[PDB]
Structures are given as C-alpha cells and as structure tokens.
C-alpha cells in the first residue's frame, strides 16, 4: 500500500455566519480554501490520491448520534435567517447554515473515504479537509464550530466494517474536544489523546472533565489522556515534551492497529484562540512521530485552525510529512516551561496506574518554514552482492576520482599500512554517499556494509564534519569504545550496549523490545531533537526491530541518516533499507512493561542528562 490520500471538495465551503456572533467569527469558510491552495501552491496535493468526497448515510451519522438530534439538524435546510440564529441559539459556540447540514455530511462522509482508503490499502496515508470540524460535537448536541462529530465516525467506522479492536485518536487542536471523550470514554478499544488550552477549566469549553484527571471510566480507565496547557505561550518543546513523554510511549505500549488525528491547527503560533507558539513545522515531526504506528496508516482530519497563515503552513507541513518528505530541522528546542512540566507530570502520575511506564518511585509574525530527493536512498551492499531494492533506491558505487584522491589522502595520512581494495572501496563509497546527502541534496539517507568499523566510522565522522555539518548524533548498536571524541560537543554518541561523559548516552538494556522502545521515545528522542544533529550516523556490528528507530530518527538532520553495517545480513540490511526508504513499519506489537532493572536505569540515565538536555525533563525541577 502506497499513496496519500486528500479528501476535499469546495462544498465544504458553501456555509458561513449569516449574523454577528463574535464567538463564531473567526469560523470562516476561507480556512479550507486557503488550505487546499497551499498544497496546491507547493505541488501537495498533485502528489496525492484525490479520493472524491460523499455525503454520510443516516445509519453511519446515528453511529455516534441521537435520533433525535440527526431529525433536528436535518431541518436545518428549510429555515430562514431568524430560525437559523433561534436554532443556533440552542447550543454552544456554533452557528447553523442552510447548507451545514449537507456539508456535516460531506465532512463526515470525508472522513469515512479517508478511513475506507486507509483500511482498504489504497493508500497508506490521508488527509481529509473538511468543515464543520468535529471533535467537540456530541450525540446530541452541535458544539465549538461542530455539527457531526467527524473522527468519532472514523473510530466507530473502523470499529464496526473493519473490526478493528485498538484505535488511537491524537487530538492537538489546542481545544479540548468533548464530543470524542464523551464518545469513547467508557470504550477501552478507542485510546484517545487530547492536549488542550485549559487554563485551570477558565478556557473554552470550561470543563473540570478536560483535566489530567479524566482517565476514563469503567473498562475505558486509562483510555482517555487529557493534557491541560494551564498557561499560552506553548512552544514546541512543550508539544514535544508532550509526544515524548506521554503520547508516545502509551501509544506505542497501546499499539494502535489504526490513528486518526483530529488535526487543529489553533495549536499553531498565531492563532487567535490557542495564543500558543508552536511553529507550523511542528506539525510534521509530531505527524512523523505518529507514522511508525499503525503500518503508517494515519487518517488526518482537519479541525480548528483559525490565523489563515499558520493553517496553510501547517497543513502543507503536514501533508509534506504524510508524504514522506524530510521533516524540517527544529531548532532552539529545550526544556518545557514549568507549568507544562507540571501539566506532564501530572497526567503522567494520574496515569501511572494505568500505564506502568509512568510510575515513579517516592521522594504575530514567524520566519516562513523553509521548502521541503530524487534518489531517497542509496544501498552499498558487497562488492558482487544484488538485492531487490524499493523504487527509491540507487546502488551508488559511482566512485569519482577526487574522491578516490581524498580517500588515498586519507590514507597516506591516518592509515598506513593499510592496502585492502575492498575497505578502501567501502570508504570510498561512504565518501561519496556523504557528499550526494550532505551537499548534493540528491539523496536524503543511506546504507553502507563495512567489514572494518574502527577505520570507517572515523572515515565517515570526520568526512561529514569535514563537509558542512555542525552536529552529528552516532547511533552505535554493541559494545566497544569507538572512534569518537564525544567531548568537542559537536558530537553525541548513543551507544546501545549490553555491558561519565554529558554529551554521551549508554544503555545496557524479551522485554529487551519494550525497554529500548521506552528508552528511544522518552531519551533517546528527546536529546536528539534537542541537539538538532546536522547528520545522524548508524552504527551496528556483529533479534531487534531498530526500523521504528531508524523511521523515528529520520525527524532529525532533515532526514540524512547514514547507516554503517559491520557485516552482511540481508535481512537487516533490508530492514535498514525500507526503514530509509519511507516504507511502513512493521508494528512492534503490544509492548509490555519493561523490567524494573531497565527502568532504573532509563532513570538514572534521565536524571544524569536532565540538567544539560532539558527536554528529558517529564518533571517539575526542584530548587536546590
Ligand atoms: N469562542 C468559542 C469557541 C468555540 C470553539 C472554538 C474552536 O476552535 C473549535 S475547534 C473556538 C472558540
Ligand atoms: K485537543
Ligand atoms: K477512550
Ligand atoms: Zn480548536
């Protein structure tokens, strides 16, 4: 399954505000325009299946509401002006149009072709433009701009015609979105996630159910996640800090056989309501750090989103991340301000007894985003050795002369005595490679098979420091000290071993799965996202699924992975080759908790690091 899906008609626009509400001014129908023609200004969504819009049957609206309320809105066409504002009256923080009733169920019908595209495998991915919004309408009730509650339709969608059993729901639309908790919260086969501008309950909706301490009810108990935002101003170490430390790793333990996103973009800086300042970049790391989980398939909905600018920029951010393209370098990312460390630990503790991962022991203007390669990949294997490589993948191997000069500089310099073809080829080619990925923009990431590690990691560290690279993260698999100076700060090392140093992270780690998954999503992400690597070097020599990590760690460098493999082992070659190449993950499936020798040491490992990478910081810091 290949392709990204884009749902969208200017029906959708064929509705407005027929009166002065200032509570609903900022709804326009110009919001989905302006968004269509972005990805039609930077050539999105001509790189997407353009599956057609329809309108949701009786039957499927009654999936999440009442009777009685799909008879009262279906009279809303036949109501002039004066009915129209009487019936608007009746509920919160909407407006009612002769033709919303028809464009509810376009939207919903959207989204139920998003979910049909997905499951069906017509394409991986989607994205589904649509309005009214949804996740704050309730079964009967229209709310917050929504008529019909879009992605609780996909949720029970996927539920009922695909008998799906585990459904995870990201909500970052800065509001809180009522309608889904209330849909799901009893329902423990619906993980829903919401982060939301809160304010100790003084924002809209007012709701002391929007708290941290809402974690579900019944069998659905520790099903519903609510981070509360208690102060504006939200950057995007806070969002991370969020993925890093309480999205993710549930959502990894859940396992999530599919994940819609009721993507709001009034999360993004400028906005009007959410007064956060979260670049629109943002969107695609956190779309990024989404697309390991359910085989990529990912049904982005659109909600909230209200300064027409920031919408455009991070839906194209969005649908760049749908499609694959390298995310865009995030930097000045730090610790989260205190009150979202106060938010984090919060949940986290409510959570705890849920979600053993997170029990602890007793003690408007904005730089525009830049543009996001013809050859994705390029593969080294063995002299003499051919594979069956994806669409986006070159064998390299085009070795030029000055290169095979520097590599002989190189040697005359550092490695005398050392006269082998085959190593000398396989530095070469690390060269070569590190120039078309780190210069030539003509490959984003790569794979080599080496035999000799200890010369060609110092080849490749210090050719791509060489080359224009300010930073550099080393994720080296095994043991033994390697050729890295991890004290210059240009630097770090993540060294996964099985047997003192700031800018270095050791992790000796069956449960090996969920212990490194624990440790990549809460440490070794964060440091990395905050030291903004120019290029990420993989190292493994010598059982483990490293493509989450090899597809997680992409986020970083603008995507330029260089992988480095002591040995041949077609099938890690080949699973380092798909992890790189954009392909979907096999799901890691239900992750336990790891052993409590594993999560003493991720602590230890946390609180020796928290002081210089804040974003490890999942607590509130305590004065000395
Ligand atoms: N003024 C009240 C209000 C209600 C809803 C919104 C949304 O953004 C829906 S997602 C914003 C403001
Ligand atoms: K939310
Ligand atoms: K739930
Ligand atoms: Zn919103």
């Known amino acids: 399954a290949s392709g990204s899906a884009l749902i969208f008609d200017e029906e959708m626009s064929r509705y407005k505000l027929l009166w002065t509400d200032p509570e ?21 969504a001509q790189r997407c299946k353009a599956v057609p819009v329809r309108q949701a049957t009786e039957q499927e609206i009654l999936l999440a509401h009442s009777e009685e309320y799909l008879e009262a809105v279906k009279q809303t066409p036949g109501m002039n002006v004066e009915e129209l504002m009487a019936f608007s009256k009746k509920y919160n923080a909407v407006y009612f149009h ?29 994205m589904a433009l649509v309005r009214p919004p949804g996740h704050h309408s309730q079964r009967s009730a229209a709310n917050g701009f929504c008529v019909f509650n879009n ?27 009522q309608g889904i908790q209330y849909c799901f919260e009893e329902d423990p086969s619906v993980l829903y996630f919401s982060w939301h501008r809160y304010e100790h309950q003084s924002f809209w909706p007012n709701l002391p159910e929007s708290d941290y301490s809402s974690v579900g009810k019944g069998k659905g108990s520790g099903f519903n996640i609510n981070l509360p935002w208690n102060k504006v101003g939200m950057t995007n170490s806070d969002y991370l800090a969020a993925f890093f430390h309480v999205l993710l790793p549930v959502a990894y ?15 993004a800086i400028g906005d009007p309501e959410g007064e956060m300042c979260a670049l629109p970049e943002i969107f695609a790391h956190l779309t990024h750090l989404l697309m390991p989980l359910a085989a990529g398939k990912m049904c982005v909905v659109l909600e909230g989103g209200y300064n027409l600018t920031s919408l455009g920029q991070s839906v194209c951010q969005t649908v760049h991340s749908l499609l694959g393209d390298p995310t865009p370098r ?7 301000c205190d009150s979202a460390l106060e938010s984090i630990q919060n949940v986290r503790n409510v959570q705890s007894s849920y979600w053993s991962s997170f029990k602890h022991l007793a003690q408007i203007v904005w730089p525009e985003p830049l543009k996001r390669a013809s050859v994705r990949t390029v593969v080294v294997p063995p002299p003499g050795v051919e594979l069956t490589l994806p669409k986006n993948c070159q064998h390299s191997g085009d070795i030029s002369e000055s290169t095979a000069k520097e590599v002989q500089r190189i040697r005359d310099k550092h490695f005398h005595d050392l006269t082998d073809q085959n190593i000398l080829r396989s530095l070469g080619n690390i060269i070569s490679v590190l120039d078309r990925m780190m210069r030539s923009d003509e490959v984003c990431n790569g794979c080599v ?3 000799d590690l200890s010369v060609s990691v110092q080849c490749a560290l210090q050719h791509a420091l060489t080359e224009p690279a300010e930073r550099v993260l080393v994720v080296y698999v095994g043991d033994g000290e390697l050729p890295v100076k991890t004290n210059d700060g240009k630097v770090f090392l993540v060294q996964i071993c099985t047997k003192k140093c700031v800018n270095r992270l050791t992790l000796c780690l069956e449960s090996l799965t969920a212990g490194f998954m624990q440790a990549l999503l ?4 964060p440091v990395a996202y905050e030291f903004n690597p120019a ?3 993989g190292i493994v020599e010598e059982m483990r699924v490293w493509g989450h990590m090899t597809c997680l760690i992409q986020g970083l460098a603008r995507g330029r992975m260089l992988t480095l493999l002591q040995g041949y082992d077609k099938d890690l070659l080949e699973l380092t080759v798909s992890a790189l190449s954009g392909a979907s993950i096999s799901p890691l499936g239900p992750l336990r908790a790891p052993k409590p020798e594993d999560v003493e040491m991720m602590e230890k490992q946390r609180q020796r690091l928290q002081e210089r990478w804040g974003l490890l910081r999942c607590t509130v810091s305590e004065s000395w």
């Not at 819609?260 to 009034?266: E, H, K, L, T």
Request: charged share 20%; hydrophobic share 45%; with cysteine.
């Open 151 to 177: 992605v609780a339709f996909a949720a029970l969608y996927a539920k009922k015609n695909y008998n799906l059993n585990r459904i995870l729901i990201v909500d970052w639309d800065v509001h809180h979105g």
């Open 253 to 267: 333990e859940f396992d999530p056989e599919l994940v819609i996103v009721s993507a709001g973009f009034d999360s």
């Open 535 to 537: 290029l990420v070097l």
């Open 449 to 451: 098979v080496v035999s």
């Open 330 to 336: 995030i930097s000045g990312l730090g610790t989260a």
């Open 24 to 44: 609903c001014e900022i709804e326009v129908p110009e919001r989905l325009t302006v968004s269509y023609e972005a990805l039609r200004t930077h050539g999105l």
């Open 522 to 525: 809460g440490l070794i992400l």
């Open 98 to 126: 002769q033709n919303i009733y028809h464009c509810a169920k376009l939207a919903a019908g959207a989204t139920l072709q998003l979910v049909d595209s997905v499951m069906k495998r017509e394409v991986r991915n989607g």
